[PDB]
Design a protein around this ligand. Structure first.
Ligand SMILES: [Mg+2]
Ligand SMILES: [Mg+2]
Ligand SMILES: [Mg+2]
Ligand SMILES: [Mg+2]
Ligand SMILES: [Mg+2]
Ligand SMILES: [Mg+2]
Ligand SMILES: [Mg+2]
Ligand SMILES: [Mg+2]
Ligand SMILES: [Mg+2]
Ligand SMILES: [Mg+2]
Ligand SMILES: [Mg+2]
Ligand SMILES: [Mg+2]
Ligand SMILES: [Mg+2]
Ligand SMILES: [Mg+2]
Ligand SMILES: [Mg+2]
Ligand SMILES: [Mg+2]
Ligand SMILES: [Mg+2]
Ligand SMILES: [Mg+2]
Ligand SMILES: [Mg+2]
Ligand SMILES: [Mg+2]
Ligand SMILES: [Mg+2]
Ligand SMILES: [Mg+2]
Ligand SMILES: [Mg+2]
Ligand SMILES: [Mg+2]
Ligand SMILES: [Mg+2]
Ligand SMILES: [Mg+2]
Ligand SMILES: [Mg+2]
Ligand SMILES: [Mg+2]
Ligand SMILES: [Mg+2]
Ligand SMILES: [Mg+2]
Ligand SMILES: [Mg+2]
Ligand SMILES: [Mg+2]
Ligand SMILES: [Mg+2]
Ligand SMILES: [Mg+2]
Ligand SMILES: [Mg+2]
Ligand SMILES: [Mg+2]
Ligand SMILES: [Mg+2]
Ligand SMILES: [Mg+2]
Ligand SMILES: [Mg+2]
Ligand SMILES: [Mg+2]
Ligand SMILES: [Mg+2]
Ligand SMILES: [Mg+2]
Ligand SMILES: [Mg+2]
Lengths: 273, 90, 43
RNA sequence: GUAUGAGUAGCGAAAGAAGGGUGAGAAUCCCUUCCACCGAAUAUCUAAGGUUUCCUGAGGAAGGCUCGUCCGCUCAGGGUUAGUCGGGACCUAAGCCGAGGCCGAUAGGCGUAGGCGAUGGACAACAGGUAGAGAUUCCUGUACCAGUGCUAAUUGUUUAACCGAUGGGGUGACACAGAAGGAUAGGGAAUCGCACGAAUGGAAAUGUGCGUCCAAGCAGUGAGUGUGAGAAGUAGGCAAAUCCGCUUCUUGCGAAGCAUGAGCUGUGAUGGGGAAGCGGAAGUUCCUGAUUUCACGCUGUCAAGAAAAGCCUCUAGGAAGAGUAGUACUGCCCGUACCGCAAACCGACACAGGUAGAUGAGGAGAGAAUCCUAAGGUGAGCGAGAGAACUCUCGUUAAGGAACUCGGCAAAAUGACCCCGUAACUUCGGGAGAAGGGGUGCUCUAUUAGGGUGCAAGCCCGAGAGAGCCGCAGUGAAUAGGCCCAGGCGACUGUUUAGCAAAAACACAGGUCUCUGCAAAACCGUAAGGUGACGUAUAGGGGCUGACGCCUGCCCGGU
């Protein structure tokens, strides 16, 4: 659920949060943790190449398998946990061997359920199969581009996709953005929907919370000088005195398309978003 | 190179005062360790060394008219011998 | 008043020392120039 | 090089006085007494930085904003001692270098294995003494860590004592806020000890002054805080595992057991420290009580909070010697002087500026505020004497009370604690300490009524009431909101032109448009390689608007 705050301060007036009712434990799995360091949008050369990044709470990386390789061995859902590195929650799986893993928590995943991987798996939320064993019309997530590489598409909280049909070596999928795409039939996917679907209703409330999440302020191009932006200059407030609005580097930025014109995957895309 | 590890004794008021407690002050070259000093002393003087302490001294800045320089660096060792041992005359 | 010079032995050695000059072609060029002029202190 | 201004400006925040001494010479150097200043510092440690400025004996050309017999100045001799402290021989972070490698007119750029790199992790010593200069370093007592030989017993020999990974696993190993406890440090009263017992009206004791202890180690204990155990079996842990992980059974409980733990007690101590006169007295009981420690222990929250070594265990392996007790011996390199809120560091100066951390007493007090003091430290490197204008920093003013001025600028006024009382409007939180009124000292009832502590003795805290007393005045000093009405702008906290502008400007949470299917778009770079992102359309980049409420109309001819 979404928890609202009483207006005891001007900073808490419109602020909403999550109640974390799905989180069953607050202690991560020590052997699956790796260190993360902030890069703040800096390069090999140490130069700022992406703006508005830097200076949040420190985090620690949790290793997650997007591959789902362990076929045949049953796995039990042990914990549902908070992950600082993504918008979804994660689930800890105990395998009957004695091996522990982290996966993306799907909608309707509960502690105590059992999940499988492979061809003999059933079509049930949390199982991973190959795209040619998944019937038409089912909602999937964690789709992989290349076989054996790991899920790449539809991984953020609340997202989902459907199977639309076969053509033999490929399968038609409708992605979360509405685009229809062709994927190899030997690529894997997980049945269900990603499970933190209320994430988009949260109202940040303060500038400080944004600074906590690692975001630096953004300055409009109109209040700069002419040597910094194509929109800078003028006496008082000024309109966009150009044929089109511009980016800080030239390059029209309202309706102008940026996908490469001679791009190699244009033969696997049936309908554009 | 026992005679190279030990250069000369040190004769001041403090060293002369501690001479009566079976402690002898020497100037040693600037690369020798405590153990080397101990074995050089035992070979040169035929005593039984109980302990060695060492310290380093920087050179002092001096002037003699339009010309300024430094004196030499020094390494100074105090050697104390066992109670049942002979003494060094100085 | 905080002034511009705030000394540090290590920082001085790491930015202007002999081994920092010897690590680049332009630093060795600086050393060669200072040797040609005849200065007593290089780096 | 030398004049003029000119014996003029200045002599860099501050309390001194007298008596002795030294000397050729004294406001200025030394000693004594009295007075004054700081005291969450102007006291004590200690990093950085400086580099001999440290001590002793001589000196007075120059330096010292005056003088100088003096000096951080000149000359000559001295002075810094470590198995345990801080660093290396131990570990790693950001970052840097980088065999082969990839990329590129040259030069070179990037990067793997590997390696450096603390501001962090691990790691064994305490208490006294030291009169020119060093002290957890020297010396005196009493220890600990790692090793070595020599003795004396014990035990083992390839179904193999014992050792054991450069490998597996566990630990190491981590945020922020809140509250209540235990203990100790600290503070204070009695008691006890030593001395005095008094100048001017009084006091031989309800008089005054000073003091009323001691480690590490070793042995015991301990407020407590976490806490489930046993047995079988193994698609996993690159091989193996008796170790871990997982599963199933029996067993289950504020009762134990196990791991941790501040402190306390005995020894250390026939020692040390210590007044009164070499000598060396007393060292008890009670109250108060942490900003320290138990301890990130408990509870709560979202923004979800290093690594590696080390240590322990497991096998793979190595193996005929091994441990045990006692003794004696072994333990390297670098730093160590002195200044360190400052005359020794950064500011050209013996410069009203700046400079990380630890400690930081009493009365009154919520307090590290405020005023006066303790321990400790200072009297500030030009003076004396007159008491004009004018300038500066201060204190009071009759009657009036903004008439001043661009403008109440500046100044004056309010201010603590307790009680009563409190408006429009509102997003229901606020507005609000709104506004406006009243009270406040001391004595007796009174070692109170009642509380805390204690076995008691006793010690600490302590209202309501009555009766009185005195001043012009009772938070009698210092420190401690002025308030109200109405309008523009920007919702708000925040940011900005170092050195003329702090804002109505920027940011902001929210809104909307647009691009992007992942070798994503976008951005840096010739490229390789990167950021985006160890992310995946509830995500990421760009444009405009700027909380919230009601809304955002017509035009696609032109670009
Ligand atoms: Mg980083
Ligand atoms: Mg840049
Ligand atoms: Mg941005
Ligand atoms: Mg913009
Ligand atoms: Mg497209
Ligand atoms: Mg030695
Ligand atoms: Mg030295
Ligand atoms: Mg020395
Ligand atoms: Mg060159
Ligand atoms: Mg002149
Ligand atoms: Mg005098
Ligand atoms: Mg000198
Ligand atoms: Mg002078
Ligand atoms: Mg002068
Ligand atoms: Mg004289
Ligand atoms: Mg001198
Ligand atoms: Mg050491
Ligand atoms: Mg090393
Ligand atoms: Mg240690
Ligand atoms: Mg032995
Ligand atoms: Mg380890
Ligand atoms: Mg007393
Ligand atoms: Mg087991
Ligand atoms: Mg005394
Ligand atoms: Mg006490
Ligand atoms: Mg505390
Ligand atoms: Mg060595
Ligand atoms: Mg040494
Ligand atoms: Mg040394
Ligand atoms: Mg000092
Ligand atoms: Mg007060
Ligand atoms: Mg004052
Ligand atoms: Mg005093
Ligand atoms: Mg009166
Ligand atoms: Mg008064
Ligand atoms: Mg600004
Ligand atoms: Mg809002
Ligand atoms: Mg936007
Ligand atoms: Mg990444
Ligand atoms: Mg967007
Ligand atoms: Mg933008
Ligand atoms: Mg516009
Ligand atoms: Mg509103």
């Amino acid at each position: 659920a979404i928890k609202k705050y009483k207006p005891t301060t001007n900073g808490r007036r419109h602020m909403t949060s999550s109640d974390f009712a799905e989180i069953t434990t607050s202690t991560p799995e020590k052997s699956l943790l790796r260190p993360l360091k902030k890069k703040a949008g800096r390069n090999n050369q140490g130069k700022l190449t992406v703006r508005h990044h830097g200076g949040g709470h420190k985090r620690q990386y949790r290793v997650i398998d997007f591959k789902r390789n362990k076929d045949g061995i049953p796995g039990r859902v042990a914990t549902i946990e908070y992950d600082p590195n993504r918008s979804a929650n994660i689930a800890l799986i105990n395998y009957a061997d004695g091996e522990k893993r982290y996966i993306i928590a799907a909608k309707g995943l509960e502690v105590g359920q059992t999940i499988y991987s492979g061809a003999e798996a059933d079509i049930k939320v949390g199982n991973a199969l190959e795209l040619k064993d998944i019937p038409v019309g089912t909602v999937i997530h964690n789709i992989e581009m290349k076989p054996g590489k790991g899920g790449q598409l539809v991984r953020s909280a609340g997202t989902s996709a459907q199977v639309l049909g076969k053509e033999g070596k490929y399968v038609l999928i409708r992605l979360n953005s509405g685009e229809v795409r062709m994927i190899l039939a030997t690529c894997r996917a997980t049945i269900g929907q990603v499970g933190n679907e209320q994430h988009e209703l949260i109202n940040i409330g303060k500038a400080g919370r944004s600074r906590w999440m690692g975001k630096r302020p953004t300055v409009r191009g109109s209040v700069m000088n002419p040597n910094d932006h194509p929109h800078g200059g003028g006496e008082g407030k000024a309109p966009i005195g150009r044929k089109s609005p511009m980016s800080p580097w030239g390059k029209p930025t309202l309706g102008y398309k940026t996908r490469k014109k001679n791009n190699n995957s244009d033969k696997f895309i049936v309908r554009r978003r | 190179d026992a005679r190279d590890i030990i250069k000369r004794p040190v004769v001041t008021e403090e060293s002369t005062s501690i001479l009566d407690d079976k402690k002898y002050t020497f100037e040693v070259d600037t690369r020798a360790t405590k153990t080397q000093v101990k074995y050089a002393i035992e070979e040169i003087f035929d005593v039984k060394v109980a302990k060695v302490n060492v310290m380093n001294y920087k050179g002092k800045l001096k002037r003699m008219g339009r010309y300024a320089g430094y004196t030499n660096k020094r390494r100074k060792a105090i050697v104390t011998v066992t109670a049942d041992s002979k003494e060094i005359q100085f | 008043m905080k002034r511009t010079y705030q000394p540090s032995k290590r920082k001085r050695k790491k930015v202007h020392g002999f081994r920092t000059r010897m690590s680049t072609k332009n630093g060795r060029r600086v050393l060669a120039s200072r040797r040609r002029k005849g200065r007593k202190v290089l780096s």
